[PDB]
Design an enzyme around this catalytic site. Structure first.
Site, PDB file in Angstrom:
ATOM      1  N   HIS A 184      44.084  14.758  34.081  1.00 33.53           N
ATOM      2  CA  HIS A 184      43.857  15.392  32.779  1.00 33.53           C
ATOM      3  C   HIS A 184      42.337  15.636  32.498  1.00 33.53           C
ATOM      4  O   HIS A 184      42.011  16.267  31.496  1.00 33.53           O
ATOM      5  CB  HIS A 184      44.582  14.674  31.629  1.00 33.53           C
ATOM      6  CG  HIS A 184      43.998  13.353  31.262  1.00 33.53           C
ATOM      7  ND1 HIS A 184      44.620  12.172  31.618  1.00 33.53           N
ATOM      8  CD2 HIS A 184      42.893  13.066  30.541  1.00 33.53           C
ATOM      9  CE1 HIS A 184      43.872  11.207  31.112  1.00 33.53           C
ATOM     10  NE2 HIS A 184      42.816  11.695  30.465  1.00 33.53           N
ATOM     11  N   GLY A 209      37.448   8.166  26.383  1.00 32.07           N
ATOM     12  CA  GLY A 209      36.427   8.044  27.419  1.00 32.07           C
ATOM     13  C   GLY A 209      36.733   6.936  28.420  1.00 32.07           C
ATOM     14  O   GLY A 209      36.101   6.868  29.485  1.00 32.07           O
ATOM     15  N   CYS A 269      39.611   6.584  30.050  1.00 26.80           N
ATOM     16  CA  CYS A 269      40.500   7.033  31.107  1.00 26.80           C
ATOM     17  C   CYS A 269      39.809   7.024  32.474  1.00 26.80           C
ATOM     18  O   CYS A 269      38.589   7.209  32.571  1.00 26.80           O
ATOM     19  CB  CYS A 269      41.140   8.374  30.768  1.00 26.80           C
ATOM     20  SG  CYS A 269      41.984   8.386  29.165  1.00 26.80           S
TER      21      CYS A 269
HETATM   22  C1  Q2G Z   1      42.164   8.298  22.968  1.00 23.03           C
HETATM   23  C2  Q2G Z   1      42.446   7.274  24.039  1.00 23.03           C
HETATM   24  C3  Q2G Z   1      42.355   5.916  23.758  1.00 23.03           C
HETATM   25  C4  Q2G Z   1      42.733   4.994  24.715  1.00 23.03           C
HETATM   26  N1  Q2G Z   1      43.188   5.332  25.929  1.00 23.03           N
HETATM   27  C5  Q2G Z   1      43.260   6.636  26.219  1.00 23.03           C
HETATM   28  C6  Q2G Z   1      42.900   7.641  25.320  1.00 23.03           C
HETATM   29  N2  Q2G Z   1      43.011   9.005  25.665  1.00 23.03           N
HETATM   30  C7  Q2G Z   1      44.226   9.619  25.773  1.00 23.03           C
HETATM   31  O1  Q2G Z   1      45.289   9.043  25.586  1.00 23.03           O
HETATM   32  N3  Q2G Z   1      44.152  10.940  26.112  1.00 23.03           N
HETATM   33  C8  Q2G Z   1      45.284  11.702  26.467  1.00 23.03           C
HETATM   34  C9  Q2G Z   1      46.098  12.308  25.514  1.00 23.03           C
HETATM   35  C10 Q2G Z   1      47.335  12.813  25.884  1.00 23.03           C
HETATM   36  C11 Q2G Z   1      47.767  12.718  27.199  1.00 23.03           C
HETATM   37  C12 Q2G Z   1      46.932  12.134  28.134  1.00 23.03           C
HETATM   38 CL1  Q2G Z   1      47.466  11.997  29.785  1.00 23.03          CL
HETATM   39  C13 Q2G Z   1      45.692  11.636  27.795  1.00 23.03           C
END
Ligand code: Q2G
Ligand code: Q2G
EC number: 3.4.19.12
Lengths: 304, 304
Positions: free
Chosen positions: B41, B143, B145
């Site tokens: 992503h 950030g 990820c």
């Molecule tokens: C904001 C955040 C906080 C903690 N861990 C991760 C995130 N980011 C997050 O989930 N981004 C995202 C949104 C929809 C689908 C996919 Cl695959 C990624």
């Protein structure tokens, strides 16, 4: 999202861990620049530990009696000295992995990460707090002495603790990196009882703000209190008295959440008086006191 | 003495963390040998995230569109490919700090350490468990990820997790290092609800054995049970069913303490039925399920 008991990345400290052997005793040393720091009880035999006269024991020790091994290679010891309860072994080689560092003496309530080590090798890392009775509730076995506690500000490692001993109650005692014990503990095999382990109130408040930031809000009430009213309750529950210094440090958390510090104090007061009623806050069924306001800010903001 | 939620030393993983930027999105990459692994992503814009067609989005991307920075220096990207939900960026330089490693797909109930990172830099390390619903209860912000989960056997790092997303419930979802998500999660901005988060029974038993080893014994009772009787209780309390495989793995703990597994099961049964009555076990007021039997053995024996 989520809140965890998080430790600092341990890499910078791993590159400093060495094994120090003196006679038949082996413990961990911390190698910074050309000096290896280790607990002075490395010179003791189990017989010596009852009433050790470290100055007298040290007279029988020469530089070659201290075997320092960094990984699988031996460091040459060109000097040795005792500073309080630590030994400083001057070696002929500066540690190439020496990070930027400071030696700091922390106050009770402050938190740090411990890189537990055995034979100079790291086994794990966990987050601790210097208890108000100057003990730490760690996880240490025989051979773990010389493992260190530390904090990290971007690239600088502030070493605050070196593990020395386990009290008969299974709690831990140690020194700062100048060899001065936290608390009244002495490096001898004598029963030394710890004082009251009070709860670090400012830390519980910080963890309650972290719970609000992360969605756990059931404990927020319609009440407020005063510092004097709160402290009457805190005294009853063996919580540390809250000062205006604590309120000031909770300022960024209060601003982030819009919850005045004294309103959070009133929530804490009701939690102390009524209990959790089978509920949880950040996956815990008790009030967590080992996150400082700085830790909550750091974790909740992503400081690296 | 003492029992802590301990993470593996993170040094070997810190040397692998890089920053990957594609367009205006920046996340973490894992650099092993001449390949940088990151969530696919990274090629998405917030607009793309609703219904992304990663194959179609990837066609518009070239090697030079992936900016890989290891510390303050740029890595040259000579190839790129998508394997399930991860991107593998072939770089022209093998990571000099590549530790011995494996990619493992863990089972639910298994634990691992997470090196949370932002902009390729580590912020902290904590211990997690793959929940039975295939989510992890981590601590991750935007950030984070590309941050990875791992275990370490002496000098070999087994990478098991790469962080991809936060579900609307604040729990976390991600892949193994082959890009396959744990659970039914998909990398898209669609509400995906998690299943029942049952308690990892074998882990609770292991943590009860760790409590006995460390002196917390008040919960030991005069009872025993059978696997079928225990599992009737476990089903009622949303605990995972206990199998003879679980009993076998608890064997070393049972042998160390002299407490038969089914006797410990009966203690657990009474703790579930009666509660803790305001008491604690290893400083916790709830039954901890994120220590495997192997973790209890390792921590209680000092494996480095
Ligand atoms: C904001 C955040 C906080 C903690 N861990 C991760 C995130 N980011 C997050 O989930 N981004 C995202 C949104 C929809 C689908 C996919 Cl695959 C990624
Ligand atoms: C056995 C152990 C376990 C955990 N932490 C530390 C230890 N070792 C330990 O206390 N040794 C010792 C005994 C008396 C006085 C002094 Cl200064 C040291």
């Amino acid at each position: 999202s989520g809140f965890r008991k998080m430790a600092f990345p341990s890499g910078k400290v791993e590159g400093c861990m060495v094994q120090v052997t003196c006679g038949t005793t082996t413990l961990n040393g911390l190698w910074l620049d050309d000096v290896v720091y280790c607990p002075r009880h490395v010179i003791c035999t189990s017989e010596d530990m009852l009433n050790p006269n470290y100055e007298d024991l040290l007279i029988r020790k020469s530089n070659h009696n201290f075997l320092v091994q960094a990984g699988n290679v031996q460091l040459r010891v060109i000097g040795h000295s005792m500073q309080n309860c630590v030994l400083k072994l001057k070696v002929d080689t500066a540690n190439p992995k020496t990070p930027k560092y400071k030696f700091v003496r922390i106050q009770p309530g402050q938190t740090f990460s411990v890189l537990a080590c055995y034979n100079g090798s790291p086994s794990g890392v966990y987050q601790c707090a210097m208890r108000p009775n100057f003990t730490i509730k760690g996880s240490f076995l025989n051979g773990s002495c010389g493992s260190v506690g530390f904090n990290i500000d971007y690239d600088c490692v502030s070493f605050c603790y070196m593990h020395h001993m386990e009290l008969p109650t299974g709690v831990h005692a140690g020194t700062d990196l100048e060899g001065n014990f936290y608390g009244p503990f002495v490096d001898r095999q004598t029963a030394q009882a710890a004082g009251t382990d009070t709860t670090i109130t400012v830390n519980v408040l910080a963890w309650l703000y972290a719970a609000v930031i992360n969605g756990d809000r059931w404990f927020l009430n319609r009440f407020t209190t005063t510092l004097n009213d709160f402290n009457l309750v805190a005294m009853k529950y063996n919580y540390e008295p809250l000062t205006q210094d604590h309120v000031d440090i909770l300022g960024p958390l209060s601003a982030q959440t819009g919850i005045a510090v004294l309103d959070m104090c009133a929530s804490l007061k009701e939690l102390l008086q009524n209990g959790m009623n089978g509920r949880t806050i950040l996956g815990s069924a008790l009030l967590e006191d080992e996150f400082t306001p700085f830790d909550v800010v750091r974790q909740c903001s992503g400081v690296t």
